[PDB]
Amino acid sequence: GSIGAASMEFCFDVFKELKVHHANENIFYCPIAIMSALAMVYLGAKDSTRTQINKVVRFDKLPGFGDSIEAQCGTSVNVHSSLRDILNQITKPNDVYSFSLASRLYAEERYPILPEYLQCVKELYRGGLEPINFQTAADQARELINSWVESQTNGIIRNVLQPXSVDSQTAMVLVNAIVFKGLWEKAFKDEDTQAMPFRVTESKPVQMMYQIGLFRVASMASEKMKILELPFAXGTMSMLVLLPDEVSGLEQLESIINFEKLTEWTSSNVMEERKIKVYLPRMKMEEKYNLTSVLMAMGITDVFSSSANLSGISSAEXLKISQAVHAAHAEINEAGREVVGSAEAGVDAASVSEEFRADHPFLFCIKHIATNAVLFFGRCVSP
Numbered sequence: 026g027s028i029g030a031a032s033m034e035f036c037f038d039v040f041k042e043l044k045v046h047h048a049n050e051n052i053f054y055c056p057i058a059i060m061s062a063l064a065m066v067y068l069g070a071k072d073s074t075r076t077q078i079n080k081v082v083r084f085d086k087l088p089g090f091g092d093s094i095e096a097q098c099g100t101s102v103n104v105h106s107s108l109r110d111i112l113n114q115i116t117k118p119n120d121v122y123s124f125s126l127a128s129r130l131y132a133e134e135r136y137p138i139l140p141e142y143l144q145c146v147k148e149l150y151r152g153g154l155e156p157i158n159f160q161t162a163a164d165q166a167r168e169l170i171n172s173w174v175e176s177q178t179n180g181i182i183r184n185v186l187q188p189x190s191v192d193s194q195t196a197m198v199l200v201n202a203i204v205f206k207g208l209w210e211k212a213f214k215d216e217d218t219q220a221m222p223f224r225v226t227e228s229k230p231v232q233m234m235y236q237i238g239l240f241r242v243a244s245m246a247s248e249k250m251k252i253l254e255l256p257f258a259x260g261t262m263s264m265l266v267l268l269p270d271e272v273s274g275l276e277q278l279e280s281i282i283n284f285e286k287l288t289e290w291t292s293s294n295v296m297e298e299r300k301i302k303v304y305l306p307r308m309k310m311e312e313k314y315n316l317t318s319v320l321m322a323m324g325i326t327d328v329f330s331s332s333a334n335l336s337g338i339s340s341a342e343x344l345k346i347s348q349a350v351h352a353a354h355a356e357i358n359e360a361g362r363e364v365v366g367s368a369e370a371g372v373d374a375a376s377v378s379e380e381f382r383a384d385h386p387f388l389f390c391i392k393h394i395a396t397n398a399v400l401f402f403g404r405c406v407s408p
């Protein structure tokens with residue numbers, strides 16, 4: 026009924042599926058971006074193709090989604106508003122963070138695109154739809170696609186489509202890549218970062234940032250875990266770090282978490298501002314997933330098969346999504362707007378005893394504060 030609710034439910038559904046084939050590895054994706062890519066496809070899907078997407082991504086009760094409203098694509102700044110409003114806001118230039126989104130549908134050129142659709146994507150989406158020749162120059166097409174994604178992500182997301190992933194039979198490809206970097210409200214000082222061991226299960230040294238400051242923390246003895254909120258500068262986004270008490274307690278947490286639990290654990294009465302010592306590793310997160318495998322296991326299957334019904338995009342028989350890929354990159358480091366002086370810090374050094382030390386596997390979420398929507402979610406087992 027709200028983007029906050031829908032993005033979190035969708036996020037945890039995706040998490041449940043990635044857990045299957047990604048045990049003991051880092052996991053990192055952008056739920057909001059995946060929903061936007063699927064919303065774009067949803068615009069031209071019909072029959073069961075459309076129903077499966079709506080059911081799995083839950084566009085159902087969302088503002089801007091639904092029968093009458095969507096029929097107005099091309100005009101009306103209301104279509105898919107609940108999603109577009111967040112993406113439109115976070116992709117704008119600003120002085121505290123950078124969020125680059127490269128999302129696009131590449132369709133074989135031989136497929137005549139329905140003109141009402143082009144207008145549709147043209148007005149609601151940037152990347153949109155782009156014609157291309159897979160038929161006789163597949164390796165050439167793959168180069169074109171990967172070079173667009175690379176160029177659009179500051180040279181960060183490279184070779185998104187693997188060789189042999191595209192051939193003379195490819196109908197349409199969905200690429201959805203995102204890069205995020207944000208400044209903390211409260212910076213960590215470079216001089217305070219030290220090599221510290223991270224107990225992966227055994228351990229390895231990692232660059233561990235450190236600072237003492239006032240932060241919202243939730244302590245849940247009942248679940249043997251703590252949650253720390255670190256605000257990004259600007260007051261529009263924050264990062265939640267869910268840290269189990271024991272080095273090997275992640276599995277339990279991952280089994281119990283969902284939208285309801287996350288909401289309860291972070292409510293204003295459970296969260297409390299406390300002077301605390303924070304240890305957080307510098308992290309360079311980057312993962313890429315085959316969305317076809319993920320979404321199919323989640324319940325979206327027709328759109329990827331000859332039985333797909335995208336008669337809203339074209340009229341040609343056989344238009345289906347032949348490959349769909351998601352890649353997300355984000356660096357977590359010291360950069361911030363303000364810092365405590367060496368004098369106050371000195372006083373805290375031996376007076377503050379409470380600490381939040383993320384030196385073992387944890388879960389983390391970057392959220393949009395106003396909507397409560399999930400922008401990124403991940404599991405960090407190796408910083």
Ligand SMILES: *[C@@H]1O[C@H](CO)[C@@H](O[C@@H]2O[C@H](CO)[C@@H](O)[C@H](O)[C@H]2NC(C)=O)[C@H](O)[C@H]1NC(C)=O
Pocket residue numbers: 187189190315317318329330346347348349
């Ligand atoms: C991604 O996962 C899918 C399903 O597990 C793999 O299967 C492909 O499915 C697409 C439909 O979107 C077909 O067009 C391909 O011909 C299928 N390829 C095969 C033989 O598996 C798909 O291969 C995976 N993508 C890659 C290259 O990793």
